[PDB]
RNA sequence: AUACACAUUUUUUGGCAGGACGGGAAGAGGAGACGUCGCGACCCUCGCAGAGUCGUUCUUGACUUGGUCGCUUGAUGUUUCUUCUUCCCGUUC
């Protein structure tokens, strides 16, 4: 079975973007690491609010709980 | 397998840490010509309050020791 | 006569009945009036020190003295310092002090009390200097100074009070700053025990059941005794 | 919390409603059983007599004597 | 287990009133109460926050969804006074 | 003798029947926030140590002359004044939300003495004067209704629009 | 052994941002659920992202009867719950 | 380690707790439970006009943040 | 009369297009094929699309890991 | 001042809370006094 | 300690009846009863009193008192109240 | 972990009300410790008035954490 | 005298977004549902007991299971739509 954890491990070291439940914020950056509780670390992050670039944040941590989904870009 | 422990309890006060090296040399000469040997010696203090001791201790000391800190102190 | 008199309803625990004055709160508010966090408790106290000087708080202001947030803050703080002052020295005639300060304010402060050999005479209300006393006087009737003295009067006066009351409390200011540095240089256990002490001092009877009334002052053969046979106590029946 | 037992207590709910009643027992989740408990909403206005109630610790905000 | 859970298990067979996180009120005879507060209820009269009232035969609501219950005063005697 | 805080601290303090809360007043005498009964209260005073937690005040069986000297008490809803000698009422009473007043068996003589009860805004719903000389005077009921229409139940009788209108007619 | 693996996973995981923050005493900015933000230095952290923060400057956004204004205040010693954290950003 | 223990150290400390609901609390910590349930005395409380309360217990999960003295 | 995990497993094998109803969100729902899942009901969903109901449009997202907490109701289309 | 004496006898040092207390008590006392002095001036 | 009253205007709601009864009978002593158990009104209220002398005094002094239009009839209860 | 005593409800048509003011009707198939439910012949009752047969025989799954309450249509 | 309390039902979250004031009345250009608890009564109804039974002992353990009409201008939330003047009574300066 291909589990979310192996898919995500393969997604590490790749450009991703993560849409939070709020959808008020999306984050596009390289996926540095993710833990067993699925908190997210991204680098070079860029914030897309309402589909527009808000700014370039850089090395960023995302609380697992806020994550709606993650997609590869 | 020895138990690790803390030995550094010193927080250099801002007023002391602001002192330049020339200032520190001068302070040592003025304090009965204090001479040091060894690497990394912290700067001398000139007041009991630059040592971060509780008020109890402060009251107690003064009480315990009357007048200015000695050069050795 | 005063059986329901309670100091704890006048002094907070951090003030220790006049030992210290609690300025952390004002660091929160005052510090925020700057819209940043570059300001530490100690740097804030460093700011307050300006008001011990007769000219610094006027010519080297933390913020622009025409800023709203700033003037409001200064008001609140001033009020605090004054109430603290009279709170910690009940025995002195409050009205006397008040009137003294007010008269000093009217007769000197607003009359070109601040003078420089170079720039001349400074005005608290317009924040400008003046060549000679002549132009200074004919400026105190101008529409500008009328406007300002008519709008920023309360603030100027409050600033002044903060000044003189902080001067009268120099010993308490220093005492507290010291306290700050101490607590700051504590560890966890230390800070905790100290807090315990302040607390106990706060919630303790003003008179202990264990106080004094009328205690006025004026103005070898070590091995030999074992050898002797006292290793085993002997007895005659 | 054990000291508060049997007292009349005021709990504030998650929805802003205020409940008042005797605290008979608690548990780990902070589920409370309140005897002769009544509800006040706005401050008396909109007061109702509920009687014996359990409240869930997930909903409870705070309690006061 | 929780002492209030023990009471709520004593409440079985009685008529109770339930308010859920939505605010609807279900009054009726409690069949069964699990440890997780999941409750099975009979002959329920329901009053909505709008004021509308309905009748339903059997209802079972999740524990987590319940704001609070009111149980009869008969139980108040004992043995929770200890 | 006097109602003083030392007395305020330690009377039988508990919750009314009605679950109305309070904390009572008896070091040796007269009480407050519960059972102010039978300790010869001359003048009400020192209500401040009550410090607000009281729904009810059972003043009955004291020697109270008038009802003034009430600090601002938001919580007090019910006053049980029975078996005193209340001749007059203060006027600036205005303890907001005083819903119930029990003047039973006192010595209020005149209609005009009742006037101060009108000040009770819309909270004084229940008032009982029965046992006073003023009750005997003519058109007592109608004058109380026209004076304090806030009352919903007078002398444990309910107002009713009929005698409201008669009170308007006179 | 179990403790070791936990600390290690913490070290090479996403937490590495807050670990790095405490060791370098670097400022980080925290987007919270209150729509307030906290820029501060990390004194201590926890698995729940409970934190002790020093030199706190919180920025926020308020609406009035005219243009939106940002408001900010300084809190020197601030302890923070771990569920309020939406995001912790580490930046130069 | 566990910061909740760090809160357990905080008895007899005067603090201002902001809560997730926005409520401001000011008072002296009598104790905090490991749940971070905080019991305080001499509390002035501002709901989002201050109510003064002898004792207040708060459920830990509701606590947004607690502001400690800078002297700590 | 089958446990939901086995239901999801037959979605996995059949590779049917799946529509998820999210939590507290009527406006948008997500759709795509289930290539895998875990015990926390986090699902890798391929050729996923966001479907705002408010005729319906949507955004193609490609491969997605959707967290199980959002999941309200998993279906087939 | 130091020896805490007024003439010959050096008195026991008191703690701050008590000193302040008594100072506020003396404060209210002086208030009473000022009041009485006033009414007296208005009666004499 | 408990007095049984009857012959009262049942048209009064339960809570107002109880508050007026507690009010009226507080003049003789503390009333311990919080609420009418009988939940049937029609006068049949029981009033529980902490001391017995207050019960006797209330009985003798308030016989046939006009209360909500009707002269109340007061007697001693047949049994002791559960709270006593 | 406790298992909900839902056996009495098995193979009965039920009206589930779910968060977001959603309501579905269907025959109770399976359940688990988690209160997650399989519903056959599921029908969504939209807020308007119409209803859509989402899972006539294909069956749906509802997360127990989203299940507000469940009404038995049958006895 | 001798470990744990962040992965579905609870606590590590789906949350966020002379002047002014009140009241009461009148005169001119706030009202309609749908509920839930009250002032009166031409009415209903008519009485001492959480209730009802038993074993053993001077007091306990088991087993079963206000309602209606008005308001003659009572109080309260969902939910749609669109103030002035005069007189009286309270607070403040």
Strand content of chain B: under 5%
User: What is the name of the CATH architecture of chain K?
Assistant: 2-Layer Sandwich
Distance between the termini of chain B: 35 Å
End-to-end CA span of chain K? 8 Å
Shape of chain K, please? globular
Instruction: Give helix and strand order of chain K, one letter per element, not per position.
Output: EHEHEEE
Could you state the oligomeric state of the chains shown?
part of a larger assembly
Radius of gyration of chain K: 11 Å
Number of E-type strands of chain B: 0
CATH fold node name of chain K: Alpha-Beta Plaits
In total, how many domains does the architecture of chain K comprise? 1
Describe the biggest sheet of chain B?
A: none
Beta-strand percentage of chain K?
Answer: 15-25%
Order of helices and strands of chain B: HHH
Number of helices of chain K: 2
CATH superfamily of chain K: RRM (RNA recognition motif) domain
Subcellular location (chain J): Nucleus
Protein name (chain J): Pre-mRNA-splicing factor PRP9
Function (chain J): mRNA splicing factors, PRP9, PRP11, and PRP21, are necessary for binding of the U2 snRNP to the pre-mRNA in an early step of spliceosome assembly.
Family (chain J): Belongs to the SF3A3 family.
Summarize the structure.
Chain C has 237 residues and is mainly alpha-helical. Helix content of chain C is 53%, strand content 2%. Chain K is built from two helices and five strands.
């Amino acid at each position: 079975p291909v589990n979310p954890k192996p898919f995500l491990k393969g997604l590490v070291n790749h450009r991703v973007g993560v849409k939070l439940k709020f959808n008020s914020t999306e984050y596009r950056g390289t996926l540095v690491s993710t833990d067993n509780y699925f908190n997210l670390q991204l680098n070079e992050a860029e914030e897309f609010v309402a589909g527009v670039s808000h700014g370039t944040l850089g090395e960023i941590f995302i609380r697992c709980n806020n994550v709606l989904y993650i997609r590869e870009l | 397998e020895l138990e690790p422990f803390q030995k550094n309890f010193y927080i250099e006060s801002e007023t002391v840490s602001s002192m330049s090296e020339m200032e520190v040399e001068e302070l040592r000469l003025s304090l009965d010509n204090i001479k040091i040997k060894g690497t990394g010696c912290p700067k001398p203090v000139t007041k009991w309050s630059q040592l971060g001791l509780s008020t109890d201790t402060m009251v107690l000391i003064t009480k315990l020791h009357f007048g200015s800190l000695t050069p050795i102190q | 006569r005063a059986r329901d008199l309670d100091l704890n309803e006048i002094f907070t625990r951090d003030e220790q009945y006049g030992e210290y004055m609690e300025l952390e709160q004002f660091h929160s508010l005052w510090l925020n009036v700057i819209k940043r966090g570059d300001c530490s408790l100690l740097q804030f106290l460093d700011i307050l020190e300006l008001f011990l000087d007769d000219e610094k708080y006027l010519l080297t202001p933390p913020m622009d003295r025409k800023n709203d947030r700033y003037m409001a803050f200064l008001l609140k703080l001033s009020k605090y310092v004054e109430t603290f002052f009279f709170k910690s020295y009940a025995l002195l005639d409050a009205a006397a002090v008040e009137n003294l300060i007010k008269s000093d304010f009217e007769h000197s402060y607003c009359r070109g009390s601040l003078r420089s050999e170079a720039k001349g005479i400074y005005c608290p209300f317009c924040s400008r200097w003046f060549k000679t006393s002549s132009v200074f006087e004919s400026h105190l009737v101008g529409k500008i100074h009328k406007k300002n003295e008519s709008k920023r009067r309360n603030f100027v006066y409050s600033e002044y009070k903060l000044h003189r009351y902080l001067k009268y409390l120099n010993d308490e200011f220093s005492r507290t700053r010291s306290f700050v540095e101490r607590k700051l240089a504590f560890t966890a256990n230390e800070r905790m025990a100290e807090m315990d002490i302040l607390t106990q001092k706060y919630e303790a009877p003003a008179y202990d059941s264990t106080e004094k009334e009328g205690a006025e002052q004026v103005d070898m053969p070590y091995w030999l005794y074992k050898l002797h046979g006292l290793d085993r106590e002997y007895r005659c029946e | 919390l054990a000291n508060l037992i049997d007292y009349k207590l005021r709990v504030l709910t998650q929805d802003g409603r205020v409940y008042i009643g005797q605290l008979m027992a608690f548990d780990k989740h902070m589920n409370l059983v309140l005897n002769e408990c009544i509800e006040e909403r706005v401050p008396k206005v909109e007061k109702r007599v509920l009687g014996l109630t359990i409240l869930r610790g997930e909903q409870i905000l705070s309690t006061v004597v | 287990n929780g002492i209030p859970v023990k009471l709520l298990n004593e409440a079985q067979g009685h008529i109770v009133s339930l308010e859920l996180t939505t605010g609807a009120t279900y009054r009726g005879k409690l069949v069964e109460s699990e440890d997780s507060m999941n409750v099975q209820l009979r002959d329920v009269i329901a009053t909505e926050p709008q004021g509308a009232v309905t009748h339903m035969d059997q209802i079972f609501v999740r524990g987590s969804q319940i704001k609070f219950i009111v149980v009869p005063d008969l139980l108040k005697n004992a043995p929770l006074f200890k | 003798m006097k109602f003083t805080p030392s007395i305020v601290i330690d009377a039988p303090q508990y919750y009314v029947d009605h679950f109305n809360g309070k904390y009572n007043v008896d070091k040796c005498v007269i009480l407050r926030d519960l059972q102010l009964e039978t300790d010869s209260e001359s003048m009400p005073s020192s209500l401040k140590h009550l410090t607000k937690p009281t729904h009810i005040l059972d003043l009955t069986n004291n020697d109270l002359i008038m009802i003034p000297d009430l600090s601002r008490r938001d919580d007090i809803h019910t006053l049980l004044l029975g078996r005193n000698n209340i001749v007059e009422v203060d006027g600036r009473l205005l303890p907001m939300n005083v819903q119930n007043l029990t003047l039973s068996n006192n010595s209020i003589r005149r209609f005009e003495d009742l006037q101060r009860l009108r000040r009770a805004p819309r909270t004084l719903k229940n008032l009982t004067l029965i046992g006073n000389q003023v009750c005997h005077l003519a058109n007592y009921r109608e004058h109380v209704l026209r004076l304090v229409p806030h009352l919903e139940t007078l002398d444990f009788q309910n107002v009713t629009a009929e005698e409201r209108k008669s009170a308007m007619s006179f | 052994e179990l403790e070791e693996l936990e600390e290690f996973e913490f070290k090479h995981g996403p937490m590495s941002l807050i670990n790095d923050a405490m060791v370098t005493r670097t400022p980080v900015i925290i987007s919270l659920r209150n729509n307030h933000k906290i820029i501060a230095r990390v004194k201590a952290f926890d698995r729940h992202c409970n934190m002790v923060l020093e030199n706190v400057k919180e920025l926020w956004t308020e609406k009035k009867g005219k243009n939106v204004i940002n408001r900010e205040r300084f809190i020197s010693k601030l302890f923070l719950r771990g569920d309020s954290v939406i995001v912790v950003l580490k930046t130069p | 380690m566990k910061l909740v223990n760090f809160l357990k150290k905080l008895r007899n400390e005067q603090v201002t707790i902001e809560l997730k609901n926005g409520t401001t609390v000011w008072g002296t910590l009598q104790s905090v439970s490991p749940q971070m349930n905080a019991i305080l005395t001499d509390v002035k409380l501002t709901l989002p006009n201050i109510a003064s309360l002898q004792y207040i217990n708060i459920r830990g999960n509701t606590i947004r943040q607690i502001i400690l003295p800078d002297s700590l | 009369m089958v446990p939901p995990i086995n239901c999801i497993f037959n979605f996995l094998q059949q590779q049917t297009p799946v529509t998820i109803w999210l939590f507290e969100q009527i406006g948008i729902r997500i759709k795509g094929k289930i290539v895998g899942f875990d015990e926390f009901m986090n699902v890798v969903i391929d050729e996923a699309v966001e479907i705002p109901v408010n005729v319906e449009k949507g955004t193609p997202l490609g491969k997605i890991l959707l967290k199980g907490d959002n999941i309200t109701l998993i279906t087939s289309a | 001042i130091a020896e805490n004496k007024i003439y010959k006898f050096k008195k026991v040092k008191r703690k701050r809370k008590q000193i302040i207390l008594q100072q506020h008590e003396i404060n209210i006392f002086l208030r009473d006094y000022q009041e009485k002095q006033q009414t007296f001036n208005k009666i004499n | 300690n408990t007095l049984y009253v009857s012959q009262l205007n049942e048209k009064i709601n339960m809570q107002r009846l109880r508050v007026n009864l507690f009010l009226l009978f507080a003049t003789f002593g503390e009333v311990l009863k919080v609420s009418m158990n009988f939940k049937k009104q029609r006068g049949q209220a029981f009033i529980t009193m902490r001391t017995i002398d207050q019960a006797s005094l209330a009985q003798i002094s308030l016989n046939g008192e006009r209360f909500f239009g009707k002269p109340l009839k007061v007697e001693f209860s047949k049994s002791e109240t559960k709270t006593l | 972990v406790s298992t909900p005593e839902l056996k009495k409800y098995m193979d009965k048509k039920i009206l589930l009300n779910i968060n977001g003011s959603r309501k579905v009707a269907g025959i109770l198939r399976g359940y688990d410790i988690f209160l997650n439910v399989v519903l056959d012949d599921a029908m969504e009752i939209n807020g308007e008035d119409p209803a859509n047969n989402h899972q006539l025989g294909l069956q749906t799954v509802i997360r127990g954490n989203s299940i507000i309450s469940l009404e038995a249509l049958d006895a």
